[PDB]
Amino acid sequence: HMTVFRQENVDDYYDTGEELGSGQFAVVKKCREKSTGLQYAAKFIKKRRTKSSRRGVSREDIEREVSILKEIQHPNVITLHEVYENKTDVILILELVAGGELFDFLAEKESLTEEEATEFLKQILNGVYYLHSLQIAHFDLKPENIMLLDRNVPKPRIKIIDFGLAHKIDFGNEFKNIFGTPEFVAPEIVNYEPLGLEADMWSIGVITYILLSGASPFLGDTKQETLANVSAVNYEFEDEYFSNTSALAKDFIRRLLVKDPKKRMTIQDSLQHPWIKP
Ligand SMILES: [Mg+2]
Ligand code: NA
Numbered sequence: 271h272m273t274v275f276r277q278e279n280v281d282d283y284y285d286t287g288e289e290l291g292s293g294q295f296a297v298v299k300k301c302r303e304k305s306t307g308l309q310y311a312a313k314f315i316k317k318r319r320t321k322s323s324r325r326g327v328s329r330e331d332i333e334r335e336v337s338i339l340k341e342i343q344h345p346n347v348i349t350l351h352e353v354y355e356n357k358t359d360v361i362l363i364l365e366l367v368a369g370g371e372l373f374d375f376l377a378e379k380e381s382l383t384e385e386e387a388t389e390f391l392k393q394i395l396n397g398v399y400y401l402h403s404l405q406i407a408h409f410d411l412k413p414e415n416i417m418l419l420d421r422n423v424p425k426p427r428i429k430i431i432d433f434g435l436a437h438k439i440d441f442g443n444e445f446k447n448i449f450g451t452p453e454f455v456a457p458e459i460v461n462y463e464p465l466g467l468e469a470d471m472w473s474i475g476v477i478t479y480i481l482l483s484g485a486s487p488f489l490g491d492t493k494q495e496t497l498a499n500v501s502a503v504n505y506e507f508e509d510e511y512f513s514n515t516s517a518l519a520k521d522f523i524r525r526l527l528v529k530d531p532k533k534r535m536t537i538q539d540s541l542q543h544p545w546i547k548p
């Protein structure tokens with residue numbers, strides 16, 4: 271079921287500028303479309319050079335990301351404008367989100383209040399509600415993959431980015447090669463079990479703990495420790511960080527950081543939880 275993308279030179283149509291993102295398999299650059307002057311983010315994904323290579327991204331994996339992206343139109347999720355390709359790269363022309371990572375914002379700013387945390391979290395929940403309503407599991411939710419529209423307002427607006435691990439969950443679970451960042455992955459990821467929408471809900475619990483405390487709940491000194499911690503549900507609320515945080519906030523996290531995916535809050539549960547619900 272593979273398709274093909276526009277094979278004119280991206281350079282003919284766009285000018286690139288500042289670098290917005292860089293990872294193992296992709297680089298993201300601001301860009302401007304010549305015909306309109308509108309600005310975008312160009313994500314250059316390196317292709318695989320042979321069938322059996324570990325370097326670059328398989329065409330299947332690229333096309334999955336593109337196909338999911340084409341489905342989406344919501345204020346809290348990145349959208350896709352165009353796709354180009356050449357021998358080396360697939361080039362996704364994505365919506366531009368220019369206010370930086372939530373990761374960097376958190377690093378740079380004072381500790382959040384519950385209101386500040388919930389103003390972020392509610393947007394994340396709304397985006398994930400959209401995705402999950404479409405049976406799209408993101409599988410890579412973390413502060414690095416939440417981008418701020420404008421970092422210089424009291425209550426920054428966000429979009430979820432980076433659909434490189436996202437999958438359609440049309441049979442309730444998927445059982446494929448899916449493994450994100452140890453600090454954020456759910457126990458079923460760690461244990462290589464079938465995965466569904468529920469994994470993203472665990473990640474949201476981790477994000478929430480971080481938003482409220484500045485600390486990562488499962489993080490060990492090595493990746494293997496972090497993974498062991500996740501699987502064991504080895505976290506606690508430290509008084510030094512949480513003494514002035516409401517018990518209802520803690521309840522919200524506690525009901526997301528649950529090993530059995532069936533018992534974990536769903537996205538609808540999270541929206542109705544008393545900490546969130548009006
Ligand atoms: Mg990305
Ligand atoms: Na345009």
Ligand code: NA
Nearest residue numbers: 343344345349
């Ligand atoms: Na939109």
